[PDB]
């Protein structure tokens, strides 16, 4: 297995992820944006069904992007939200993040850690609209010299082949 | 039981004065009649020829609500079969794409060849002592499949006009995107699939006749989005002229331009590529279609696309109050890998389930569908009067029936076509009614 | 297609002998005919005048399944508009309450004034060269809106009797709650909204004609709940007399009392306040209506309320097997802040989604609806025979048709009214049939 | 409104040539007509007599979509009542099984005796001054309940043939499982309940006429599963002869054998027990029915079972596109506790919601139902031609109409019975049509 | 940030909340009642949609109560359950509590801690009735001198504007 | 209360359960099988509704089995999956395990611990098929001399009286 972290490091990283999720839930988008590192890469792919022979050989049908964002892209989405003309988020949706199965492992890069969690995102919109997104997430966190952490990378997996929500206007 | 006899479609549409009744987006018997007469006879998009390149390659798609498999034959041709076994109607194929030599039913074990013939019935001598004629029990074949410059169109009927005669003048505007270079076009990297809770007519009407909505719905995206040179500002600000073509249910619209500039959303490398290949595009097509890099198009019923962003969409109806979206990113086959990656990034950033522009469109369609539940919210007339009575035929090399870009000739034509198809048995009567309507619209 | 011709409503209701067939709670064509004829013509509760106090204030509610906006004009009056744009039927307002100067459609940008006039169509000279008449394309207005002592009632029809003539004698019992003091009444602190999976007729019938159920359904609450002085024991134990009024579909019921005592559930401060203001209440109303502080009332179709607890409810139908509950806590405008807080606490503790008493009612309605799926469970006659043949008119100052509290005159009258409205075209015929039925019930 | 007049059932089924149209699995008016005419007249399985052994014991089940309660009387008999009160149709019993002395409605408080009589109406003298006749307001009783060797069958109609005349020749094959020993049979340890999203006709047809599917659907289970001696290999490999009986909608099928061997799935102790009791089984029944320990059976419409595994199933329809499965594990009453535990373990391991064999069957039915949404996927003929024209009557002591095991006489007979019941009013006409069809099938 | 607790305090408080949830799930209502402090305040409000101008100004439409309970009120509800005449809970519903994102912070009051969690409450009733409640909860816990903890306050947030269940007969 | 474990033991057991869940999610069935002890007992029962008198007396209607597996039974199911002829799992379903409310207690047997968790299993199959299973699980873990853990017993509780999925082809 990988050279795992101690108790304190796991506690700190888990608390940092909890605080980030709370920031996303409390509609403090600028602070959440300030929590991210400069070189963030915020990706997400589709999911397909392959033939049994393809699965055994390791071959998969072609996929594509749903999210491919740098830090400026996320900034730009937030600034679109702040204008008040984003009719997709008027009124804003109310979301809750549940983070579980937190597994933390080291990396050969000094002071950069890899994290794998399972997430359940509950998105409730106005007047009886509910949606559940369930999946896994591979993040990376960098520790600065000021005892604070920054999100260096985030990879999201959504387990729906045919997404059942007309849009994804909320950040994962 | 569904009996169309007591239905009267013509009372819900008034294309002469430009009025519509919103019941058509909710009535379920209307939806069943649609499934019987619209999707049962009109040509439907199956797949791009670059997804089934070699013999034995298949692709799983839909034609209406029906599952269909499209497979490339051994001699080079292409066939489409209804994805259903002949013994208890079990599904024979489940994957999205791949290579296969036979389709095997997982329930009992009947096996079919890639050309639809029944090649293996387990224990035939015992189970069928009187003999089974394997010829009558082949897969259900789509009698009409035809390819146009890379796009495969299928049709359940056989009395319909051919693909060229059915497309008519929209081929002139479609060649502007399919025929830019030498070597055709090709699909890049997978399909995006999702579900929107709205009737299928809303996106068709918007992509056939609405450029107006882009002024106020996508204002935030214009403010925020607008490192190689992109367009300075949205085209409608600086455009000198405009054009919208609407005929036989097909629609198109764009702004005239002086330089090969796409919209502001596209990445810089895409615009650089278009500027580079402008010379070849002008050589093949002409001046008007080579400068056309921003607009909207729609082929009836469910084939939509945009020019500059290089995005193509297919709209599968799922009941009277849902639709499923299939999205393709199609580029030129002669481009390089970096340009193809730029095209993919631009298209998926702009018009995905999480793109800056599809958000508002989907939200608005869903809101309209939610409002339409009540009894008084679906019995009140609406306004289709934009640009009414201003239809003219150009004489400078652009064919069809034309109008200014902010008009609703295309939507009125589409609704007339839909009401004519629903209310007529044979295709000849559809053609006669459409010819009479087009005679009336000019006088 | 919905054709009421093969329907025969009168065979499912027997108000003479007191029998009912449970199919009426499930049939979907029955529900569509209801949406067309019951909610399309009868007066419906919109809002309390204290929620739109100043010009430009609005409130978003429903009238049936239709979204409606109620807005206070500039001169002081009140108007109600169908919440739907005239261009693709998009929703113009989304909030619950607030102040606004114009309603702006978010899809294209059409803007309307708070009086329903179309004031801004973007790019009219270009998009509409032939000219658009802004007068015909105003918002859909409810032709009949009228306020009664603070409650606003709207009606889609115009041939219906006025609000006073439609209320009739139920106004006498409603004044007992609206007209207790000087200065009217007012709503305290928000609305409670939830969904119950039952037909809308169950709560209407229970609140119109059922006090009997409180003996056995709410026995646990009586045991457990029953620090200022509240009622010693439930009223039905010690009450000397009782009265139930049922007429034209409206219902009311209560127990006579010797002192101003509410039920046992109310908080002490509420009872102290009622005892304090008994003198003024007696001065304005009289002896009978000032001692009336416990009972049930219902105005057809969907306006229910209770006296002592100071709770008001509205029942929005959502399909043939669902209903949505809107709950208000209304107090006297001349009270103090502490008394208002006590009223809010009592009402929300007793009759919320988590109140001791609504629990059982909702559970029982849901169970009945679940049982009604089968074919034999919805074709078996039921018993409406309670107190049949004992109807009399009092002559001591209480008007209408009366009976003992444990009877079903109100429910039978409501069902007769519902069957008469469903089976008749004009309101005059409804009135004639109701007059004939009321003549028959006394002989 | 449902009007069967424009329906034509006979055009969707062709039992002479062996074709079927898949619309019958989707049409909702077909489902309502089924609920009215199939489940309203045919005998339905209620419960085993070992679940209500003592007076006052009850069991909550269904008859179609209707909730039913089966209770053991005081003199020893058994009665069944529609689980619905006579005052607002509230549910009187909610548990699965237990002992009770009276059913009390939780809404108002009406109480009924275990024989369906109304014994207590609270406040009758006040609420019903004119008097209530308690005799007419008893619970709704099933007019026909009859027990056969431990299984209780109920019927809503009274013009139907008795249970023995209705079962006919399937009793000969059912005795092979019910009558193996002295002392009857009994249920072991509870009921398994789950939901499958498929029409109820698929499992009925499979359990009536499909042993063929076991060759290819359950191939993985045969490979992997096949510590006392079990069967060496699946029976169809080594079997010398085979037999399938299909008549009046009932079906059965099995392979002849030389030694008392069950299938390969059963645990060793079960096979040892069967080998031990082979002598007594042969003494009571005979040579053919004592060696029969592997096969499939089905009694129309919804009573399915398997021989060796000792599993029994009931199929409750829930709409036109769902079904609910109730599963029982029934053993011999004279066995020991260890053998009973072995039987329970084997049955629940093999045919539960997570058993090796039910997996594929449920998956395939769900896939067929999903495919059937489209318009062309439910209007294409299928093949019922297996073993057609090879029907013969044996003369060695096995009664009925027979065929080889890999045939579809049973399915064709079931479909003819279903179409005859749907298209006829009285049971006499059903019998005449079935007699004519059975005359035709032999010539 | 706030002066966070150490590892052991977080462990103890999280275990206490887990045990309380287990008590509510195991139908031991008297023991759960004995777990609460005397001055408990058990509140819950509604949720509304506001105009964009109202959101920017900080103005919100009026709300109301769904739960406003002291300890005696909760006792009284439990005693209503114990009578066997509560037809809304016959048979009783089966509920599961999932507690995640446990954030624990101190307070200026000595030996009183503040806790914020996300909760998913799964309520299954008889014969195919399921309901999911997702939200956040702000609790407070007091440490006694006997090494044991007591629930001093509980504030519950439900993210549905129009609640889709006919009643809330289960405690959160 | 029971003599609870320290912080480190809870951390180790929770990480072991997380890794097992990840193995089940990553379609590494042979490794998951190698994680189990020889004497595993993998059970699951049904759930019924009892009368109020039966509930008070402690009487319950009869139940039955849904899972009754030894280690060889689980091996046999995995080997059925590996053949490629299991039409119920072609294509395989995508599942996510969320483990919460981890309570760990000792046992009188040396070096064997008891664990109680709440689980949410999200099972998504091809083309818009989703299912949620919510419940509780009583596991037991044995610590070997090689610092590694093995699953000695697992008891699963599913809170649905009428299961709403046509089959359970995935391991819990």
Q: Distance between CA B83 and CA F10 in Å, rounded?
A: 53
Return the CATH class of domain E7-158.
alpha beta
- Asked if B160 contacts B166 with a C-beta cutoff of 8 angstroms, the reply is yes
Q: Do B94 and F128 touch (CB under 8 A)?
A: no
Strands E94-105 and E112-125 come out as: antiparallel
- Asked if D292 contacts D244 with a C-beta cutoff of 8 angstroms, the reply is no
Check CB contact of D354 with chain F, cutoff 8 Å. yes
Q: Are residues D254 and D381 in the same domain?
A: yes
Structural domain of C58? 44-146
Q: Which residues of D touch B91 (CB under 8 A)?
A: 367-368, 370-371
Residue C97 lies in a domain: yes
Q: Are residues B265 and B361 in the same domain?
A: yes
B18, B8, B19: which is closest to B441 by C-alpha?
A: B18
Q: Distance between CA F151 and CA F41 in Å, rounded?
A: 9
Q: State the CB neighbour count (10 A cutoff) for residue B330.
A: 21
Residue D50 lies in a domain: yes
Q: Distance between CA D354 and CA F159 in Å, rounded?
A: 16
Residue B35 lies in a domain: no
Q: Distance between CA F101 and CA F135 in Å, rounded?
A: 11
Q: Distance between CA B104 and CA B31 in Å, rounded?
A: 33
Residue D162 lies in a domain: no
DSSP assigned state of F4: B
Residue D37 lies in a domain: no
List, in sequence order, the alpha helices (H) in B373-443: 409-422, 427-441
Report the interhelical angle of D28-37 vs D409-422 (nearest 10°). 80
- Asked if D108 contacts D122 with a C-beta cutoff of 8 angstroms, the reply is yes
Q: Distance between CA C311 and CA C346 in Å, rounded?
A: 10
Give the residue carrying structure tokens 């089934």.
Answer: B52
Q: Are residues C276 and C309 in the same domain?
A: yes
What the block records as the tokens of C245 is 């009024």
- Which chains share 3+ C-beta pairs under 8 angstroms with F? A, B, D, E
Strands F149-158 and F129-143 come out as: antiparallel
Of D210, D261, D321, D420, which one is the catalytic site residue?
Answer: D210
| CB-side neighbour CA atoms (13 Å) of B314 | 21
Q: Do chains A and E touch (3 or more CB pairs under 8 A)?
A: yes
- Asked if F137 contacts F157 with a C-beta cutoff of 8 angstroms, the reply is yes
Dihedral sign computed on CA atoms, order A3, A4, A7, A12? positive
Within chain D, how many helices (H) and strands (E) appear?
13, 22
* Residue D226 belongs to domain with CATH number: 3.90.380.10
Of B213, B228, B241, B432, which one is the catalytic site residue?
Answer: B213
Q: Distance between CA B310 and CA B351 in Å, rounded?
A: 10
Residue C155 lies in a domain: no
End-of-domain residue from the set C94, C113, C146 = C146
- Asked if D353 contacts F66 with a C-beta cutoff of 8 angstroms, the reply is yes
Q: Are residues D108 and D173 in the same domain?
A: no
- Asked if A78 contacts A33 with a C-beta cutoff of 8 angstroms, the reply is yes
If you count them, how many residues does chain C have?
A: 443
- Reported resolution, Å: 3.1
Measure Cα distances from A52 to B85, B265, C248, F84, F123 in Å: 20, 40, 70, 7, 20
Residue C227 lies in a domain: yes
DSSP assigned state of B161: P
Residue of F nearest to E81 (CA): F52
Q: State the CB neighbour count (10 A cutoff) for residue B213.
A: 16
Q: Do B95 and A66 touch (CB under 8 A)?
A: no
Q: Distance between CA D39 and CA D297 in Å, rounded?
A: 20
The dihedral region occupied by D216, where left means phi > 0, alpha psi between -120 and 50, and beta the remainder, is: alpha
Kindly write down the DSSP assignment for every residue of chain E, as one continuous string: ---B--HHHHHHHHHHHHHHHHHHHTT-HHHHHHHB-TT--EEEE------HHHHHHT------EEEEE-HHHHHHHHHHHHTS--GGGSSPPEEEEEEEEEEEE--SSTTEEEEEEEEEEEEEETTTEEEEEEEEEEEEEEE-TTS-EEEEEEEEEE--SSB-SS---S--
- Chain mean position to CA C351: 16
- Asked if D138 contacts D218 with a C-beta cutoff of 8 angstroms, the reply is no
The dihedral region occupied by C404, where left means phi > 0, alpha psi between -120 and 50, and beta the remainder, is: beta
Report which secondary-structure segment, H or E, holds D402: strand D402-403
DSSP assigned state of F58: T
Q: Are residues C347 and C243 in the same domain?
A: yes
Contacts 24+ apart (CB under 8 A), F31-37: F32/F171, F33/F71, F33/F74, F33/F75, F33/F78, F35/F150, F35/F151, F36/F71, F36/F74, F36/F150, F36/F151, F37/F71, F37/F142, F37/F150, F37/F151, F37/F152
Within chain B, how many helices (H) and strands (E) appear?
13, 22
Dihedral sign computed on CA atoms, order A73, A76, A78, A84? negative
Q: Which residues of E touch C60 (CB under 8 A)?
A: none
Q: Are residues D202 and D311 in the same domain?
A: yes
E36, E96, E94: which is closest to E69 by C-alpha?
A: E36
Q: Which residues of C are catalytic?
A: 108, 210, 213, 218, 361
In DSSP terms, E105 is beta-bridged to E4, E114
Interface contacts (D, E; CB < 8 Å) = 7
- Chain mean position to CA D360: 20
- Asked if B114 contacts B78 with a C-beta cutoff of 8 angstroms, the reply is no
Mutate one of C217, C242, C376 to test the D interface: name it (highest D CB count within 10 A): C376
What the block records as the tokens of C150 is 């603070």
The dihedral region occupied by F161, where left means phi > 0, alpha psi between -120 and 50, and beta the remainder, is: alpha
Give F92 to chain B, closest Cα distance, Å.
Answer: 12
- Between F7, F18, F91, which is nearest A7 by CB? F7
Active site residue B48: no
Helix (H, G, I), strand (E, B), or coil: what is residue F129?
Answer: strand
What the block records as the tokens of F63 is 């139940």
- Among chain C, residues having any CB pair with chain D shorter than 8 Å are 3, 6-7, 22, 29, 212-213, 215-217, 360, 364, 367-368, 370-377, 380, 382-383, 385-390, 404, 406-407
B397: Cβ–Cβ under 8 A, 6 or more apart, which residues? B286, B288
Q: State the CB neighbour count (10 A cutoff) for residue B70.
A: 24
Q: Distance between CA C304 and CA C310 in Å, rounded?
A: 11
Kindly write down the DSSP assignment for every residue of D100-117, as one continuous string: -SEEE-SSS--EEETTS-
- Asked if D57 contacts D77 with a C-beta cutoff of 8 angstroms, the reply is no
Q: Are residues B268 and B349 in the same domain?
A: yes
Q: Distance between CA B266 and CA C350 in Å, rounded?
A: 59
Q: Are residues B372 and B255 in the same domain?
A: yes
B87 is in an annotated binding site: yes
Q: Where does residue D338 rank: exposed (0-12), middle (13-18), buried (19+ CB within 10 A)?
A: exposed
Give the residue carrying structure tokens 């269940």.
Answer: E165
What the block records as the tokens of C226 is 């029953």
- Count of domains observed in chain D: 2
Q: Are residues B177 and B124 in the same domain?
A: no
Give the residue carrying structure tokens 């990553």.
Answer: F26
Q: Distance between CA B355 and CA B347 in Å, rounded?
A: 9
Q: Distance between CA F166 and CA D194 in Å, rounded?
A: 7
| CB-side neighbour CA atoms (13 Å) of C409 | 27
C97 is in an annotated binding site: no
- Asked if A46 contacts A64 with a C-beta cutoff of 8 angstroms, the reply is yes
Within chain C, how many helices (H) and strands (E) appear?
13, 22
Give the residue carrying structure tokens 């007419």.
Answer: D136
The dihedral region occupied by D95, where left means phi > 0, alpha psi between -120 and 50, and beta the remainder, is: beta
Check CB contact of A126 with chain C, cutoff 8 Å. yes
Measure Cα distances from B93 to B33, C132, D117, F167 in Å: 28, 55, 59, 21
Residue spans of beta strands (DSSP E) within C26-164: 44-48, 57-63, 66-72, 78-82, 97-99, 102-104, 111-113, 118-120, 144-148, 151-155
Q: Where does residue D136 rank: exposed (0-12), middle (13-18), buried (19+ CB within 10 A)?
A: exposed
C250 is in an annotated binding site: no
Q: Do B84 and D380 touch (CB under 8 A)?
A: yes
Measure Cα distances from B5 to B432, C131, C338, D8 in Å: 22, 39, 66, 18
D329 is in an annotated binding site: no
Q: Distance between CA D204 and CA D196 in Å, rounded?
A: 13
In DSSP terms, E43 is beta-bridged to E68, E155
Dihedral sign computed on CA atoms, order D193, D197, D198, D203? negative
Strands D382-383 and D402-403 come out as: unpaired
- Asked if C81 contacts C198 with a C-beta cutoff of 8 angstroms, the reply is no
Which sequence spans correspond to the domains of chain A?
7-158
Q: Are residues D137 and D175 in the same domain?
A: no
Kindly write down the DSSP assignment for every residue of C153-197, as one continuous string: EEES-SSSPPHHHHHTTHHHHHHHHHTSSSS-EEE-S--EEEEES
Helix (H, G, I), strand (E, B), or coil: what is residue D86?
Answer: coil
Q: Are residues C226 and C358 in the same domain?
A: yes
Residue B23 lies in a domain: no
Q: Distance between CA B413 and CA C195 in Å, rounded?
A: 43
* Residue B95 belongs to domain with CATH number: 2.102.10.10
Q: Are residues D130 and D176 in the same domain?
A: no
């Amino acid at each position: 297995m990988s050279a795992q972290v101690s108790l304190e490091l796991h506690h700190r990283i888990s608390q940092f992820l909890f605080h980030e999720a709370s920031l996303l839930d409390d509609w403090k988008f600028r602070d959440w944006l300030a929590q991210l590192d400069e070189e963030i890469r915020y990706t997400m792919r589709t999911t397909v069904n392959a033939q049994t022979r393809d699965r055994r050989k390791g071959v998969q049908p072609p996929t594509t992007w749903i999210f491919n964002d740098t830090k400026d892209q996320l900034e730009r989405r937030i600034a679109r939200l702040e204008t008040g003309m984003a009719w997709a988020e008027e009124p804003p949706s109310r979301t809750r993040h549940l983070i579980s199965n937190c597994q933390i492992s080291e990396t050969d890069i000094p002071n950069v850690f890899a994290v794998r969690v399972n997430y359940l995102l509950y998105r409730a919109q106005k007047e009886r609209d509910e949606t559940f997104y369930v999946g896994t997430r591979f993040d990376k966190v960098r520790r600065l010299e000021d005892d604070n952490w920054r999100l260096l990378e985030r990879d999201i997996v959504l387990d729906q082949a045919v997404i059942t929500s007309h849009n994804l206007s909320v950040l994962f | 039981m569904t009996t169309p006899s007591d239905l009267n479609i013509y009372q819900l549409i008034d294309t002469q004065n430009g009025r519509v009744t919103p019941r058509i987006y909710t009535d379920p018997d209307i939806y069943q009649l649609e499934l019987e007469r619209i999707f049962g006879r009109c040509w439907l998009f199956l797949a791009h020829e670059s997804q089934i390149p070699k013999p034995g390659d298949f692709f799983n798609t839909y034609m209406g609500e029906d599952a269909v498999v499209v497979v490339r034959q051994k001699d080079g041709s292409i066939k489409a079969f209804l994805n259903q076994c002949r013994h208890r109607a079990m599904r024979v194929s489940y994957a999205d794409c791949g290579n296969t030599r036979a389709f095997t039913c997982p329930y009992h074990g009947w096996s079919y060849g890639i050309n639809g013939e029944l090649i293996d019935v387990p224990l035939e001598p015992r189970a069928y002592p009187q003999g089974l004629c394997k010829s009558h029990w082949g897969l259900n074949e789509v009698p009409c499949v035809e390819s146009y410059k890379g796009l495969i169109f299928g049709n359940w009927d056989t009395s319909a006009p051919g693909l060229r005669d059915y497309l008519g003048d929209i081929a002139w505007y479609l060649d502007g995107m399919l025929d830019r270079r030498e070597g055709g076009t090709e699909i890049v990297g997978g399909v995006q699939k999702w579900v929107i809770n709205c009737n299928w007519k809303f996106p068709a009407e918007q992509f056939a006749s609405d450029q107006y909505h882009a002024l106020f719905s996508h204002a935030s995206a214009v403010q925020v989005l607008g490192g190689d040179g992109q367009t300075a500002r949205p085209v409608w600000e600086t455009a000198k002229d405009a054009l919208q073509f609407g005929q036989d249910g097909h629609g198109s619209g764009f702004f005239f331009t002086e330089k090969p500039d796409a919209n502001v959303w596209v990445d810089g490398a895409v615009s650089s590529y278009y500027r580079e290949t402008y010379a070849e595009a002008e050589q093949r097509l002409g001046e008007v279609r080579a400068l056309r890099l921003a607009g909207h198009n729609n082929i009836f019923p469910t084939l939509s696309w945009l020019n500059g962003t290089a995005t193509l969409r297919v709209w599968h109806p799922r009941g009277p109050d849902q639709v499923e979206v299939w999205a393709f990113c199609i580029t030129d086959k002669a481009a390089s890998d970096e340009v193809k990656a730029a095209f993919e990034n631009s298209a998926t950033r702009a018009f995905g389930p999480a793109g800056f522009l599809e958000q508002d469109d989907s939200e608005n369609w869903c809101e309209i569908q939610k409002l339409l539940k009540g009894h008084r919210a679906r019995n009140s007339k609406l306004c289709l009067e934009m640009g009414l009575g201003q239809e003219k035929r150009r004489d400078d090399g652009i064919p069809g029936i034309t109008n200014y870009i902010f008009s609703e000739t295309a939507a009125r034509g589409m609704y007339q076509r839909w009401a004519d198809l629903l209310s007529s048995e044979s295709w000849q009567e559809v053609l006669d009614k459409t010819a009479a309507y087009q005679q009336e619209v000019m006088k």
